[PDB]
Design a protein around this ligand. Structure first.
Ligand SMILES: [Zn+2]
Ligand SMILES: [Zn+2]
Lengths: 302, 302
């Protein structure tokens, strides 16, 4: 059924600059992101954090789009981002209402070496699975991985979760507060292909069943802390930059300043992602342990 | 003349983590940085910026070690880093007194792709030139570059400039707020060799005249800005990560989102350094243009 309202959000985290740059340019000339019979609105979600070139002002914008915050009485005392979440929800939602935007792409960067990443929230979601498959195939031979979040709560609080079909776009490695040409080119391409898909679907194109490989988070792995709770070992050079690649029971994982290796253990293979992400220091995380699985989509047709 | 007081400073910028990690470990176990008949003191220069994992709190510590700040009446209303500069200057200085520390290494990281870098402030400084030559030779085949700052004011304001022999140690690429193993192993190797040098000098070893190549900044090059003063093009993919390598009048330098290349121009070769450093966005700088020159040292002997 016909897709009408599409947004591309940038600056959810103010120091992830690829999104900010694109959206700002598109707000002056949207030609690249328009499709015949499709309105795409670019929007900067966190202006204050973008001016300060900072992750957030008062709290993470990408973690509060839920009934607890979006439903509390509007007030000058409320943390900036809460205040902002309610504005965004009024513009592009209300979340869960039939009037809400159909598809939102929320753009993000990581310091991890992940390349092009799509983030999926519903594991049972044929339309989005189909889209991700289309993107994957278009980027080839450029790799493109799909990261799967499966809350047994069935609830999400991400900025994009306003949409009927939320799409997370993440590209790394890029230092925060830095704009790399290569990274910008990758994200552009992903967007170009995502919009091609929407457009083709709206033109009534048929899509046979398809399958994608996804990586589902099973555990946040923390750094070894010491007596005082301080980081006591660091990501081993062998693991560094090896996001998505298999890591076995034997393999090096941490290195201590005194020079010893701490190996994986457990007794099956895992797929580290978000290996050494800047934002995951404070929030105690060296990487995420993921399982690799296949999702299937039924054929779809508008 | 005999070198007694040596300091290694970490956390001058709170979110350059290599220095912070080493210094903190050394404060628990200094064995690796001790030498026979040589006392080396590790110190964390910017504790609050290190706790908040942030470049600074009120202003850049590395920018205010000068008469204008170091000489103002101590009070609780002074910017934190000013207070802290006074504390530091009294512990390891007073800057310009005969009692001040002899050598200070200030540890730093850059998001630029510079590898191991030594920063020199006096261009006419035999003892330092001799040291840098030793460290370069020692590291080889690992590359190691010397960056030369030459103020016609004759005045410096860096944290390390308290010492009779200030030494800047910078290693990249590393995103802020991230600890990479390879980068840590590089910095510690540089330190290991610097301290070997001092030790050998103290043992009365002779050093013949020597020469090093250095890179002296001639101009901070800014991003093209638009009518509103906003960044309008970005570091060209060809220039990205090509710190130290020669860039000629023809060569690509910036890329616009609309896809055009902005070439170097002028009419001689230059050596880009600090290409795309996070800290230099606000501070209006895409990279530093440098000339390559040769410094000569007379023979030295304790
Ligand atoms: Zn983000
Ligand atoms: Zn620094």
């Amino acid at each position: 059924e016909h897709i009408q309202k599409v947004a591309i959000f940038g600056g959810t985290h103010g120091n992830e600059l690829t999104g900010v740059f694109l959206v700002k340019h598109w707000l002056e000339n949207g030609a690249e992101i328009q499709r015949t019979g499709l309105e795409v609105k670019p929007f900067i979600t966190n202006p204050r954090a973008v001016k300060k070139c900072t992750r957030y002002i008062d709290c993470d914008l990408n973690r509060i789009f839920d009934l607890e915050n979006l439903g509390k009485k509007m007030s000058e005392d409320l943390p900036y981002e809460v205040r902002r979440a309610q504005e965004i929800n009024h513009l592009f939602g209300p979340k869960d209402s039939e009037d809400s935007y159909d598809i939102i792409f929320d753009l993000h960067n990581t310091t991890s070496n992940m390349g092009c990443t799509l983030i999926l929230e519903d594991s049972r979601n044929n339309f989005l699975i189909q889209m991700f498959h289309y993107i994957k195939t278009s980027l080839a031979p450029l790799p493109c991985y799909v990261y799967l979040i499966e809350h047994p709560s069935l609830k999400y609080a991400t900025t994009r979760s306003i949409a009927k079909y939320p799409v997370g776009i993440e590209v790394g490695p890029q230092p925060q507060g830095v704009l790399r040409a290569d990274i910008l080119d990758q994200m552009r391409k992903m967007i170009k292909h995502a919009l091609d898909f929407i457009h083709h679907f709206n033109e009534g194109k048929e899509f046979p069943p398809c399958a994608i490989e996804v990586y589902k988070i099973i555990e946040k792995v923390d750094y070894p802390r010491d007596e005082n709770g301080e980081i006591a070992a660091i990501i081993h050079p062998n693991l560094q930059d090896q996001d998505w690649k298999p890591l076995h029971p034997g393999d090096p994982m941490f290195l201590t300043l005194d020079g010893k290796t701490i190996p994986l253990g457990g007794d099956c293979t895992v797929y580290p992602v978000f290996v050494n992400e800047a934002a995951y220091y404070e929030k105690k995380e060296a990487f995420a342990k993921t399982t690799k699985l296949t999702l299937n989509a039924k054929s779809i047709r508008c």
